[PDB]
Design an enzyme around this catalytic site. Structure first.
Site, mmCIF file in Angstrom:
data_model
loop_
_atom_site.group_PDB
_atom_site.id
_atom_site.type_symbol
_atom_site.label_atom_id
_atom_site.label_comp_id
_atom_site.label_asym_id
_atom_site.label_seq_id
_atom_site.Cartn_x
_atom_site.Cartn_y
_atom_site.Cartn_z
ATOM 1 N N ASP L 60 84.991 62.679 -26.989
ATOM 2 C CA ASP L 60 85.125 63.719 -26.187
ATOM 3 C C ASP L 60 85.253 63.450 -24.089
ATOM 4 O O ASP L 60 85.554 64.277 -23.825
ATOM 5 C CB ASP L 60 83.728 64.091 -26.706
ATOM 6 C CG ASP L 60 83.277 64.849 -27.196
ATOM 7 O OD1 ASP L 60 84.240 65.179 -27.954
ATOM 8 O OD2 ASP L 60 81.875 64.687 -27.860
ATOM 9 N N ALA L 61 85.945 62.604 -24.149
ATOM 10 C CA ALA L 61 85.755 62.464 -22.498
ATOM 11 C C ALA L 61 86.907 63.492 -22.172
ATOM 12 O O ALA L 61 86.421 64.091 -21.425
ATOM 13 C CB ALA L 61 86.689 60.716 -22.487
#
Ligand SMILES: [Zn+2]
Lengths: 286, 69, 52, 83, 83, 83, 83, 83, 52, 83, 83, 83, 83, 83
Positions: L60-61
């Site tokens: 998800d970064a």
């Protein structure tokens, strides 16, 4: 001349047909050739296809009219390696007694290979030799016959006739329409089989019509795109520069080393689909 | 429908007869074998094997490991 | 480029080369091929008969 | 005309391009199973080959109906006749 | 009329092109598992082939509706008669 | 008027094309596993067929909705009346 | 008035078409493993089937909001009143 | 006329680009199975390599029909004559 | 030049290609054909010996 | 206002449509592995079902933000107030 | 002029960007299977490395044609000359 | 201003929607392997669950950066400045 | 002027965007098999790491060409000089 | 300055959106294999974690260039000047 004109000239065929006044004449421009309708003939396609087919069968006849049945000479040793290769290819796919399937596969493989091999000779040699021998400077002349969609469509529409022929000849007229409408879906109930005929017909009919088209356009696409790259690499030499007419040699060499594999492979695929499609027309595969 | 089944140890036969289903604990997960099943080989973890037959619907045998073929 | 012409011509020309090969080229080559196999089969069989 | 003719060149590129994309991924999935089957059973290679070419007729059918309507739009035009 | 006829050419390419892409990948997946099963169980091949053609009907069902509607939009046009 | 009608042909192509793409791949994935299961246990094939049909109903549900809204946009278009 | 109604026809095809594409591939993945488990454990099919319906409810959750909003835009357009 | 010339450049890019995408993914699938088969038995490598090229003729068939037509749209142009 | 150049450029590339072609493509094919030529003679010798 | 409102319908269709597409494929992948585990070890099912819902929360997190922003752009409009 | 020039810049990004996408997925698929064989059979590495470079030539074949026609389009322009 | 503002609404839809699509497929792949590992080693679940959350932070970064920039373009606007 | 410059910004975004998309998918396929080999054969990890960096250069070859061309278009637009 | 700026918001969305999509799918593939290796042999986890971070650098390298360029075009703007 311009690069566009050089490319436009290499894509036109030697057409002969019905001129505005008379059924005897060659078209002098692309538009005058497009005016000639379906009742016309590409004289370069029929002149290269017939000449190469007769050279192949004459050489194969020289090794068949005097076959030794013992120690083979250099010529018949090669011809027998080809017949043994084709016979093995047919026996690993077809189990019937049909005498036409084996010589057909040999004819298909060797002819297509020769019609494709003339692409390796330099692209301006034959077009200019024809012009010099004729005395003209605007003569259309294409050597590679498998780069014409009519030549490749003729080779597949003829294999399709043999498929519809053998399918009716061994399954009968009832068996032909049966595989086309009662396969792959069948049911005991009369209402159901009638409602399954349109579904069976869509599935089976589409696959049957796709066979000849795919055989012709796979061969046409690999050869037409193959010669286009040679014509485009020749324009790099038209520039007249030194560091461009050196890079062009590397692309031409690399393309020819790649194209000999494609020329050999396309003849093999056409032969194998001819063997497979004729063998599945002799038995109920479902 | 039935398939012949034998449970055999290095010393003697534990079971031998016709069955309709065989249920066992494979090393990767549990299995249910029936007549016509494709050739399979596996390593078995310690536990009970269940056999099914007409009347003999719960013939259970405890096994300490081994292989199923 | 695509213009429909010479389709019937190439179709007929193909059948002519196929039937010529079927009649003249194909049968003699297979007969000559089979003779070597028959001669070698007779030779290996005859060697077994000699020992037998 | 200029839009009906210029939006037929995009139509042609999608009929042949989406078919070129699906047949290269489909024959790479089909062929990946043929080469492993040819290793698991070396004696079955001639049977696996004839069965693979039967699947190949189903795999390319809709793609070949599209290379035909695309060639039909490139040298004839059913839309330009409608002004 | 030139915008409706030009957008119809793209609609037709999009109907057949997406169907070609889907069926080619779908048969690559289905057929790949048929060759995997045929290699393990060469006795089951005639039974597996009948079951493969049952699935082939479900795989191309919607795709056929798409090419049927695509051909209908080229030789007839329900949009041109609505302007 | 011409924009709405032209952009309703693109809507129909997307509703049927995207549906056809998903349905073809979905049955390629589902049907492949049905052949793998049928090869493992030819005794359970009668039971596996009905279970595949239960899943087939779920797989095509939204595709069938889209193909009904696309034949509604084609015959008696709902957006033409709005303007 | 015409661009908002033309662009909302494409918004309805994106909402249903992207939902149809994803749900057809999603059920092919989920359903393929349901049939594999049924072939491995013939006696567990009534247990695996109830677990498949729990996942089916999650898989189609956002897709049902998509078709709900798509049919709302088709019969009761909320954007035509905002200009 | 500029629309027909500009949309031919996009048609050429889509026609070559979708072929470059399909051939690289399709042969990376087939190639991986060939290397895996070579690792399982290096005695069958000459045979497996020949089988890989036999599938390479089916996989790259239609992608060359688009590379030929695209190179025929960059130098020649069938759409400019049609106005 | 143009046509004059393209003609010498094509022919130079073809010559370079034919050079390696008859040095690496033709010889292995001839060796495979000659190998078959020796194998049929050695195979036929055994069938000749069997008559002795 | 007309083009901002027309492009907000497409923005909403992309937010909900891409979210519906991803969530259906994501649960098809997560779900198939849950059924595979349930068939192999039925005693682990109570734990595996709790572990699946921990992943289901992470899987839908950004999709639900997208649906929340799409409903905001539909019943209110942050772009129209910017002219 | 500006439309041909701007729409040829988008044709270069489609030619080089779609080939970049394919070559990266294709080499991850082929090299993943090479590293799998080198762990299984660490003695066949030298042979498998050569067979991988042969297949690499087939993968990066239509991509180099497109990366070369796209450098022809940025430093020369066959479309501009057509007015 | 009306075209800048309307194209920032599509920028926001692309920026949140492509992130949602990737994150849903990515967690379906990660989570399906977590359930497979958890069924194989029940005593390792406490460790595997912590290791899954390490990967969830990498997965998800970039999606969180996309959601952050999309909210920035919705309530503030680096483009309405026309700068 | 604006259409050449504006379409160049999108050409730039397509080159680095499609390259970023393909290299991340490709290095997860490649790297996923590097970790699988390393867990099974920990004594071979020094060899597997070197063999992986040889596939990394092939996987990033066409993508680094796209990145270089994208920066060239941004700081030296070669189309603004073509009228 | 209304076309150049507007199309720059689309460019920024494609840069971070395609990067987010690829990075999320790439880590799902890479991380799923990290958990598979960690479950096969629990004592290899310290090594597998360090090998995963080496691959994570190769995986995100191009996405980080895309995020950097997207934030460059957001606060500064090379194409605004070029006019
Ligand atoms: Zn039948």
């Amino acid at each position: 001349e311009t690069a566009s004109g050089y490319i436009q000239h290499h894509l036109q065929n030697l057409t002969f047909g019905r001129l505005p006044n008379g059924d005897w004449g060659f078209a002098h421009t692309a538009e005058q050739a497009k005016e000639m309708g379906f009742w016309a003939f590409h004289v370069d396609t029929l002149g290269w296809s017939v000449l190469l087919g007769v050279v192949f069968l004459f050489i194969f006849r020289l090794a068949a009219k005097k076959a030794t049945s013992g120690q083979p000479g250099g010529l018949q040793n090669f011809v027998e390696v080809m017949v043994e290769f084709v016979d093995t290819s047919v026996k690993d796919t077809f189990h019937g007694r049909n005498p036409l399937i084996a010589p057909l596969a040999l004819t298909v493989f060797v002819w297509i290979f020769l019609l494709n091999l003339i692409d390796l000779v330099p692209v301006d040699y034959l077009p200019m030799l024809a012009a010099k021998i004729t005395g003209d400077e605007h003569l259309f002349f294409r050597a590679v016959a498998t780069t014409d969609p009519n030549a490749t469509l003729g080779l597949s529409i003829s294999v399709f006739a043999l498929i519809v022929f053998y399918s009716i000849k061994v399954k009968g007229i009832g068996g032909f329409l049966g595989e086309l409408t009662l396969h792959p879906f069948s049911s005991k109930n009369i209402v159901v089989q009638i409602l399954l005929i349109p579904v069976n017909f869509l599935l089976e009919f589409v696959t049957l019509i796709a066979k000849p088209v795919s055989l012709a356009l796979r061969l046409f696409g690999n050869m037409y795109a193959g010669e286009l790259i040679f014509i485009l690499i020749a324009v790099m030499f038209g520039s007249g520069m030194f560091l461009l007419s050196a890079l062009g040699v590397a692309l031409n060499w690399a393309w020819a080393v790649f194209h000999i594999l494609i020329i050999t492979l396309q003849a093999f695929i056409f032969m194998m689909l001819t063997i497979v499609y004729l063998s599945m027309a002799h038995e109920d595969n479902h | 429908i039935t398939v012949h089944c034998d449970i055999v140890s290095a010393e003697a036969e534990i079971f031998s007869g016709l069955v309709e289903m065989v249920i066992a604990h494979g090393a990767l997960g549990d299995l249910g074998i029936a007549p016509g099943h494709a050739p399979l080989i596996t390593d078995l973890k310690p536990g009970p094997i269940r056999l099914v037959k007409q009347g003999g619907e719960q013939e259970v045998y405890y096994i300490s490991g081994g292989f199923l073929e | 480029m695509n213009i429909n012409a010479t389709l019937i011509g190439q179709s007929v020309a193909f059948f002519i080369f196929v039937l010529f090969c079927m009649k003249f080229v194909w049968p003699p080559v297979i007969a000559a091929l089979q003779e070597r196999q028959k001669k070698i089969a007779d030779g290996l069989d005859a060697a077994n008969r000699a020992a037998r | 005309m200029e839009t009906v003719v210029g939006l037929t060149a995009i139509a042609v590129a999608l009929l042949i391009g989406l078919g070129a994309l699906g047949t290269a991924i489909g024959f790479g999935l089909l062929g990946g199973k043929f080469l492993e089957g040819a290793a698991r059973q070396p004696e079955m290679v001639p049977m696996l080959q004839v069965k693979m070419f039967i699947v190949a007729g189903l795999l390319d059918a809709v793609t070949m109906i599209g290379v035909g309507i695309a060639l039909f739009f490139t040298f004839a035009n059913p839309f330009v006749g409608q002004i």
